[PDB]
Amino acid sequence: HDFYCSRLLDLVFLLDGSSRLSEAEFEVLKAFVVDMMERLRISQKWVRVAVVEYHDGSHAYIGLKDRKRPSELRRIASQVKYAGSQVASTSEVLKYTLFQIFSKIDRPEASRIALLLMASQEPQRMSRNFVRYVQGLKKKKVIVIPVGIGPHANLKQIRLIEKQAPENKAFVLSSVDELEQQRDEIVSYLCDLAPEAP
């Protein structure tokens, strides 16, 4: 509907930077992130946002404590560079979320959610400590919401995420074209997990 989110929430967008998404498909992914951010009350007192493109490493474009205006944050999200890497590592970006983004829980009153937008399957070698990163995030009360996009999304890892906590709800889409159709449902679900201000 005409829904907007004004809760105590740290929302992290993790964008698959592999060639499983074309440059075109990746523009539609960024558009979805921008569309989502337009339904957020972005502020240090309300919804804080982070945006990372992940390949075999993590490229952070927005940090939670970046004191820039929302208009500028939505622009930075719009111009996230297409990588088209051979590998996108869900393990790598969850490790990055655990040890860098949520290194310190210095805003304990807010809910913490990582939207994991995945279109690929990492080499098994890289998945060694996948479950421990997901469990590590659970122990920081970080909700991991996997969004499977294309037919190469790691369904094994989506299921492994779902089982670790009841609030780790999976969204399994056929392509990026279905993202805009579920924006209201996804943003509504994220928001209802976050507490209202006193």
Added chain:
DNA sequence: GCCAGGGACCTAAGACACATGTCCCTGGCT
């Protein structure tokens, strides 16, 4: 005992691990 696959966990409050260690299930190899 060795190798290749699939899982469960400790090294958990910042790491550096795409790494060691323990346990369980398959399939090969004197």
